[PDB]
Amino acid sequence: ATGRTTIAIDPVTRIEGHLKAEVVVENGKVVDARLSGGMYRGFETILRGRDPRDASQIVQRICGVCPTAHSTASVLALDEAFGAKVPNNGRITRNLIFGANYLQSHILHFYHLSAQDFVQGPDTAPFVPRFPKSDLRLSKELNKAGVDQYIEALEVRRICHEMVALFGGRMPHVQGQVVGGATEIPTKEKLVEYAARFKKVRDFVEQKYVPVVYTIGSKYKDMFKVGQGFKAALCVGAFPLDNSGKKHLFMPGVYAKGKDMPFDPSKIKEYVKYSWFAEETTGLNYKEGKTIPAPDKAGAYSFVKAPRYDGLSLEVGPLARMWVNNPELSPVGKKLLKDLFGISAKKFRDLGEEAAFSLMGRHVARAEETYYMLGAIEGWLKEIKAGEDTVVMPAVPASAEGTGFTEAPRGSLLHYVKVKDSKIDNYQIVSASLWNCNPRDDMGQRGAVEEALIGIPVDDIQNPVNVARLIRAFDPXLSCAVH
Amino acid sequence: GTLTGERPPVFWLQGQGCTGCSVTLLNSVHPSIADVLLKVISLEFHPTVMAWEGEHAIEHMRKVAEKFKGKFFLVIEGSVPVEADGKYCIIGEANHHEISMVDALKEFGPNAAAVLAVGTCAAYGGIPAAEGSETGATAVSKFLGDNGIKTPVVNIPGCPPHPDWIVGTVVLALDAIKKNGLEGGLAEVVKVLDSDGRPTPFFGRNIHENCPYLDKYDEGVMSATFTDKVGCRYDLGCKGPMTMADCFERKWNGGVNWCVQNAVCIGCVEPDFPDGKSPFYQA
Ligand code: SF4
Ligand code: SF4
Numbered sequence: 001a002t003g004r005t006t007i008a009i010d011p012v013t014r015i016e017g018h019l020k021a022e023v024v025v026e027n028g029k030v031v032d033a034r035l036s037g038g039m040y041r042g043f044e045t046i047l048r049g050r051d052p053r054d055a056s057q058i059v060q061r062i063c064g065v066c067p068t069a070h071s072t073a074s075v076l077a078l079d080e081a082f083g084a085k086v087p088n089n090g091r092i093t094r095n096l097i098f099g100a101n102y103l104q105s106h107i108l109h110f111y112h113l114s115a116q117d118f119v120q121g122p123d124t125a126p127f128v129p130r131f132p133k134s135d136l137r138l139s140k141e142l143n144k145a146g147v148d149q150y151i152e153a154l155e156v157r158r159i160c161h162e163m164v165a166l167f168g169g170r171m172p173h174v175q176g177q178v179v180g181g182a183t184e185i186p187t188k189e190k191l192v193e194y195a196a197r198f199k200k201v202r203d204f205v206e207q208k209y210v211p212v213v214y215t216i217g218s219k220y221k222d223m224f225k226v227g228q229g230f231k232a233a234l235c236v237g238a239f240p241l242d243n244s245g246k247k248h249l250f251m252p253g254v255y256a257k258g259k260d261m262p263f264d265p266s267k268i269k270e271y272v273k274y275s276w277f278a279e280e281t282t283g284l285n286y287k288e289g290k291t292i293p294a295p296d297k298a299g300a301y302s303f304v305k306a307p308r309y310d311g312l313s314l315e316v317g318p319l320a321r322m323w324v325n326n327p328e329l330s331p332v333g334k335k336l337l338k339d340l341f342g343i344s345a346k347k348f349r350d351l352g353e354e355a356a357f358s359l360m361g362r363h364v365a366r367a368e369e370t371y372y373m374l375g376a377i378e379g380w381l382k383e384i385k386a387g388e389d390t391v392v393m394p395a396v397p398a399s400a401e402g403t404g405f406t407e408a409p410r411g412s413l414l415h416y417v418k419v420k421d422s423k424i425d426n427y428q429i430v431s432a433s434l435w436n437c438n439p440r441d442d443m444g445q446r447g448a449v450e451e452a453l454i455g456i457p458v459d460d461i462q463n464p465v466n467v468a469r470l471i472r473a474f475d476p477x478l479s480c481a482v483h
Numbered sequence: 484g485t486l487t488g489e490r491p492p493v494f495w496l497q498g499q500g501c502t503g504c505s506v507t508l509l510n511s512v513h514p515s516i517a518d519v520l521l522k523v524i525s526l527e528f529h530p531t532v533m534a535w536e537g538e539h540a541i542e543h544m545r546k547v548a549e550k551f552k553g554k555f556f557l558v559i560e561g562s563v564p565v566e567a568d569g570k571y572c573i574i575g576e577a578n579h580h581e582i583s584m585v586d587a588l589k590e591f592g593p594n595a596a597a598v599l600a601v602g603t604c605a606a607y608g609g610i611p612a613a614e615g616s617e618t619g620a621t622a623v624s625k626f627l628g629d630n631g632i633k634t635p636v637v638n639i640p641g642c643p644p645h646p647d648w649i650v651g652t653v654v655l656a657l658d659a660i661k662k663n664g665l666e667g668g669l670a671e672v673v674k675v676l677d678s679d680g681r682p683t684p685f686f687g688r689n690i691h692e693n694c695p696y697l698d699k700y701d702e703g704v705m706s707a708t709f710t711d712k713v714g715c716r717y718d719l720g721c722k723g724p725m726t727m728a729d730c731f732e733r734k735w736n737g738g739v740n741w742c743v744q745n746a747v748c749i750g751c752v753e754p755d756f757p758d759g760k761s762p763f764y765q766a
């Protein structure tokens with residue numbers, strides 16, 4: 001048996017943003033963890049005093065990987081506050097703009113962020129140097145397939161951004177979503193252009209990406225046995241499928257302690273004992289949220305606040321959404337689960353709680369979700385009406401409030417705005433990687449990733465590769481988490 | 484390019500950025516990002532994409548920086564916050580010491596061949612320096628000057644920049660250096676920067692004076708809803724008149740759209756962005 005080694009990793013690379021992870025290893029396993037989000041900008045104070053319509057541009061600069069998610073949450077919050085009634089065709093157009101970035105983001109995450117955890121790249125920077133014992137298990141052929149797909153995926157993710165820009169104007173940082181809808185009516189010609197790009201993305205997802213995740217996973221079966229954490233998840237709903245506000249591609253729900261429960265947003269509170277914010281601001285629901293930085297506060301270790309749902313520490317993201325909603329698995333997933341794993345499965349939960357809530361399970365969920373999104377986009381391409389108006393032009397209210405709820409590629413996102421004297425009085429963001437990558441709450445309960453690190457194997461303290469492998473399975477974005 | 488050609492070392496440091504300047508670069512069409520990474524530059528440190536991590540990644544950058552002292556390119560994405568002794572942006576930890584963005588720029592800035600301030604945050608402060616902020620977010624050139632660091636700075640702004648502005652500025656610099664050496668080449672680059680540090684091939688022309696809707700502007704024919712694509716966008720908030728960029732011709736994302744066609748220009752390449760360009764949706 002071995003004793004303790006304490007390992008600090010700053011920067012954690014092949015994520016978005018600024019993260020330090022510190023783990024305590026005893027006898028070959030992580031026994032404690034602390035995550036530190038290291039960069040703060042303070043959008044919630046920058047936004048104050050502005051014309052509320054500016055928010056749907058300003059807030060995207062929280063993150064240039066998921067800006068369409070922030071755009072969406074912001075315009076939904078503004079729609080509610082302004083009483084803007086988005087035309088049906090604008091609802092669909094928004095779904096086409098945002099849906100295309102789910103494809104971009106998941107492909108970016110698996111190939112350009114995560115795949116080097118399992119694949120040795122070409123012998124030049126930024127693929128070397130790396131840990132001398134990186135635990136890269138793939139055959140020469142399968143490793144080369146991984147590199148070839150990494151390279152192809154650079155073009156595929158770029159094509160996804162062309163899809164976003166067709167009706168979104170440009171990407172990163174769309175111009176095409178505003179309060180009241182979408183700024184550009186889709187034309188027949190541009191819908192052909194979107195569909196032609198979408199077909200190429202679909203073929204890559206179906207033929208390369210989903211199969212490679214199961215295939216690599218089958219060489220790392222041990223990675224389905226670690227990373228469970230609390231086995232607790234959150235989904236707030238996303239992609240409205242009609243104009244009622246009640247039907248969504250991903251429906252809301254909470255899962256914790258083995259039980260499904262409804263989602264009530266009034267049960268969200270953000271704690272700050274272990275966060276660099278003034279102690280008087282602890283425990284606030286977002287409708288009363290406050291952002292008062294305290295970078296010298298003793299005992300704190302992160303610029304991420306600690307959100308809790310009725311006291312529960314929950315995770316968010318593809319696993320959360322796919323677990324809560326339990327869709328049918330992809331045809332190739334069903335086949336490869338049988339052929340490579342001996343698993344008979346029809347729906348996502350047939351993986352079982354332990355394997356789903358695991359390091360490799362989160363990669364599988366993300367690939368499955370990418371396939372699921374293809375069918376949603378196909379549906380929207382059949383439902384959209386070329387030439388039909390997509391926007392209304394609402395007057396700015398003097399006094400109002402609104403909340404926008406959606407699912408960013410990494411998990412649940414909400415924006416809350418309060419307007420007073422026709423200007424932003426408060427704006428509060430509760431984002432996906434906030435739920436995943438937060439520090440302890442005021443009672444000392446760890447954040448989701450902190451808890452999922454417990455039990456991670458570190459058989460070689462000189463090459464502790466599984467620490468960051470676990471972190472990357474959650475697709476962290478610390479710029480989103482801190483804002 | 485060729486896989487076996489000369490490729491200068493680049494370190495890419497993120498301060499108060501959003502990673503959008505990195506993502507926009509990933510969207511380069513010609514040359515593709517694969518070709519940039521394998522044939523044009525050697526990206527030795529970049530936290531979003533590099534293989535190694537933590538103190539080992541920092542030490543790798545330090546070893547390359549010593550070997551190529553005076554000769555590496557330093558890209559900065561995001562602003563540099565000076566308040567609270569730099570604590571609003573920590574970029575790494577090595578030798579049991581945290582490394583702030585302030586520390587990192589003081590360490591590597593003096594030893595770079597040139598600093599490329601990519602994006603409006605790095606070039607001019609941008610959103611992190613806007614009204615309501617409290618981190619002391621500072622533009623690269625100002626931070627370096629305040630600290631006596633004389634290394635040349637080239638600004639490639641935008642929020643985000645177009646990939647062609649980033650790659651094209653790199654290509655222009657590398658060509659000047661091939662013809663004239665490092666000092667002579669950087670002198671030739673500086674000669675083609677405007678008063679805001681921006682390369683004139685990309686930022687030397689005004690959007691509005693080259694806009695396809697200029698006739699409508701001059702006739703006073705203004706769209707009243709975003710989806711009316713016939714009229715000028717001025718009353719909807721377009722900041723084209725005060726913006727120097729080539730978007731009207733280059734467009735975005737493989738030429739599929741641009742901000743004025745789709746909605747409005749928000750003036751994202753300008754030193755006063757965002758506050759001097761706000762409100763975005765009124766003239
Ligand atoms: S105000 Fe904008 S849309 Fe109108 S002519 Fe000028 S740049 Fe073009
Ligand atoms: S059109 Fe205006 S807002 Fe759009 S990228 Fe060009 S300068 Fe920036």
Ligand code: FCO
Pocket residue numbers: 063066069070408409410411412413431432433434476477480481
């Ligand atoms: N996806 C994404 Fe960004 C994060 N985390 C948000 O919300």
Ligand SMILES: [Cl-]
Pocket residue numbers: 065066067068069070101102105408409
């Ligand atoms: Cl997004």
Ligand SMILES: [Fe+2]
Pocket residue numbers: 044305428429430431482483
């Ligand atoms: Fe927040």
Ligand code: NI
Pocket residue numbers: 016062063064065066067477479480
């Ligand atoms: Ni993000």
Ligand SMILES: [S]
Pocket residue numbers: 016063065066410476477480
């Ligand atoms: S993100």
